[PDB]
């Protein structure tokens, strides 16, 4: 018996990739001008059918951590935000002397001087501000506040038609690249997945938006699920994805409105027009969450052994991070997550109040502040809490009481939430084999 080099073409061989990835969605209206920050049909509507197929016997090592998609989405999405914002008003005529008054707590009632559409008249103009929009200019004086950015950053108000609303995007692999899906729920993002599949384009990944708790991202099965880079790095992020959904309906109880002023001749700014005044709040009835967490603690113990566990508040660090935070409509919430994370979990026989903000420092960048448009609505939220960005106490605190706090430790990790199932890969069609032959 003897042998030659032969090549079969297109045989399935693949490896991890720095490859770029492009959006798809259903067509929301087909027109390029459809109001949206993620995919206003500037993303091409590639086939909304995931024409996926089974990887029968194909065992693959996944890697959720050296994945390319996290950095890619993280860079991409920030760029989407910028190229939705550049078309709308920069707010260089907005850092100014602010006068404020105190009213029924932490929603200040305010007025200031500014240009109009004419570059002459100091128009006196009026707006509400949630207190965390501002700082004192130099001293504790009623006329003397500035917008919280101006200290180090410029701001940009999106047209109220850039809707932050999370329409799904599907990342497609371009041809000669592919997406492998771990086709099991009983799985974590490092080592083998035994059951698997492939698709050209991800099943909808929420563009999500979360800060501390996973919103809108789907559930698991078999058990509650935990994912982390290395669980022995107590500081680095731990993701929980629940086997059960939970739903939160946060509300601005205040009948607050789009007033509008022309801060220059093409520059429509949305001032916050008022109606009693109460703090933003949410309903999530304790006992569903409580016994959900009781089982989360068990999946955590499946690593740690038999510890009584606590979930406790985020604390000390920047409120932009240390509250749980998300959009509803076009305004941003910042909730004292303590009311849902101040809780204790034995081994044996075992609702949030919130603040609104208008200015945000999204993705923790320098510069490029966003002042959110005050929405015309008694704004409401209708959304699923579905998972937890836990951080485990860095205090190794030997073997009695080990514990966690929720964190916003990376918005990359807010994406990892759903990304974990997808391994983006190159296909190499280079099928060398022994056979025998002679040229025709």
């Amino acid at each position, epitope marked *: 018996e003897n042998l030659w080099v032969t090549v079969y073409y297109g045989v399935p061989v693949w490896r991890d990739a720095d490859t770029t990835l492009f959006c798809a969605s259903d067509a929301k209206a087909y027109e390029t001008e459809k109001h949206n920050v993620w995919a206003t049909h500037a993303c091409v509507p590639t086939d909304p059918n995931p024409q996926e197929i089974h990887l029968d016997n194909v065992t693959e090592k996944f890697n959720m951590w050296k994945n390319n998609m996290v950095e890619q989405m993280h860079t991409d999405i920030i760029s989407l935000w910028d190229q939705s914002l550049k078309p709308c008003v920069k707010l260089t005529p907005l850092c100014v002397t602010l006068h404020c008054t105190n009213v029924t707590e932490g929603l200040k009632n305010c007025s200031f001087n500014m240009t109009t559409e004419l570059r002459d008249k100091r128009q006196k103009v009026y707006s509400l501000f949630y207190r965390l929009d501002i700082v004192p200019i130099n001293e504790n004086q009623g006329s003397e506040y500035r917008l919280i950015n101006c200290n180090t950053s410029a701001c940009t108000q999106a047209c109220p038609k850039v809707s932050f609303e999370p329409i799904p995007i599907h990342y497609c692999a371009p041809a000669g690249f592919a997406i492998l899906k771990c086709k099991d729920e009983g799985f974590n993002g490092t080592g083998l997945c035994k059951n698997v599949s492939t698709v050209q384009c991800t099943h909808g990944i929420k563009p999500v938006v979360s800060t501390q708790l996973l919103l809108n991202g789907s559930l698991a099965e078999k058990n509650i699920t935990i994912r982390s880079e290395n669980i022995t790095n107590n500081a680095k992020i731990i993701i929980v994805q629940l086997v059960q959904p939970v739903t939160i309906k946060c509300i601005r109880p205040n009948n607050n409105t789009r007033k509008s002023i022309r801060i220059g001749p093409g520059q429509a700014f949305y001032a916050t027009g008022d109606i009693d005044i109460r703090q933003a709040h949410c309903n999530v009835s304790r006992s569903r969450w409580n016994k959900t967490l009781q089982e989360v603690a068990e999946k955590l113990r499946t690593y740690f052994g038999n510890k009584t566990i606590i979930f406790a508040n985020s*604390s000390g660090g920047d409120l932009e991070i240390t509250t749980h935070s998300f959009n509803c409509g076009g305004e941003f919430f910042y909730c004292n997550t303590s009311g849902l994370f101040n809780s204790t979990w034995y081994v044996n026989s075992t609702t949030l109040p919130c603040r609104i903000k208008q200015i945000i420092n999204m993705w923790q960048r320098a510069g490029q502040c966003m002042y959110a448009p005050p929405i015309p609505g008694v704004i409401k939220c209708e959304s699923n809490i579905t998972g937890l960005l836990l951080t485990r106490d860095g205090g190794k605190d030997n073997n009695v009481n080990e514990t966690f706090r929720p964190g916003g430790g990376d918005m990359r990790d807010n994406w990892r939430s759903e990304l974990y199932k997808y391994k983006v890969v190159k296909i190499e069609p280079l099928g060398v084999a022994p056979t025998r032959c002679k040229r025709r």
Partner: antibody, heavy 131, light 102 residues
Framework: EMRLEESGGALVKPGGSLRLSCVASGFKLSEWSLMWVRQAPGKGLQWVSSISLNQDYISYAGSVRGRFDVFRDRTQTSLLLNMNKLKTEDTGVYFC??????????????????????????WGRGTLVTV | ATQPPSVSKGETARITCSGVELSSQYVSWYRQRPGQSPVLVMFHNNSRASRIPERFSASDSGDTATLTIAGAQDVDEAEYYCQTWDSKNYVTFGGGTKLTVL
């Protein structure tokens, strides 16, 4: 058995400057942490500061040590304390110790999840420094 | 956070450091004889005194780190302090005490 050791000092000027560095023995110095104290005269004990293992894992104590500086260098003996604008508050025996830890230092800080363990192992002789 | 500021011969020493409230991994204490350096006694139960053989321990009241020196008839040796680092990048000490014997 191992001995933890530093530079000779001086009867330093008030408002003066000084340097003291590791000259310890019995082990590979090998990035193991700087650690020292203000053993203030006739008092108990107080920190040197927060401290470095490999350089860049150190901090002042509070705002208080901001007038001083701290180093490691490629030369492992330069596990060093640099002293400037010296106060009567700076004074004491600068005894020093090995540290029972080997890691970096950071996270979202204040009271939130930094793991990076710190700890004092065996201890050796130091110089009484006063104005 | 601190221990409070005598014994007769043949008794054994026991002192709590915290100052009405302390918890968690913020636990440590180091002995001294004046003129000598300070001296390791305990860090987190697996780093321990070279010269009190096996005769010292941690313990808690619900609010204390504790110099549980309960077998140290090597008792003339008694001056001690506590230390930790768990605050904002910040080392910390318990102000310590002697105990005379004779």
């Amino acid at each position: 058995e191992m001995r933890l050791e530093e530079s000779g000092g001086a009867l330093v000027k008030p408002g003066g400057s000084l340097r003291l560095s590791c000259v310890a023995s019995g082990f590979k110095l090998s990035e193991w942490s700087l650690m020292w104290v203000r053993q203030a005269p006739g008092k108990g004990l107080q920190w040197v500061s927060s401290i470095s293992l490999n350089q860049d894992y150190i901090s002042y104590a509070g705002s208080v040590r901001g007038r001083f500086d701290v180093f490691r260098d490629r030369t492992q003996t330069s596990l060093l304390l640099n002293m400037n604008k010296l106060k009567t508050e700076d004074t004491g025996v600068y005894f020093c110790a090995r540290v029972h830890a080997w890691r970096y230092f950071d996270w979202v800080n204040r009271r939130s999840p930094v793991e990076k363990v710190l700890s004092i192992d065996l201890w050796g002789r130091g110089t009484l420094v006063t104005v | 956070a601190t221990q409070p500021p005598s014994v007769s011969k043949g008794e054994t020493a026991r002192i709590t450091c915290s100052g009405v409230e302390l918890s968690s991994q913020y636990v440590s204490w180091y002995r001294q004889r004046p003129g000598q350096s300070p001296v390791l006694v305990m860090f987190h139960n697996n780093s321990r005194a070279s010269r009190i053989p096996e005769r010292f321990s941690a313990s808690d009241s619900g609010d204390t780190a504790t110099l549980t020196i309960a077998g140290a008839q090597d008792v003339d040796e008694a001056e001690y302090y506590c230390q930790t680092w768990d605050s904002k990048n910040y080392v910390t000490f318990g102000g310590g005490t002697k105990l005379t014997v004779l």
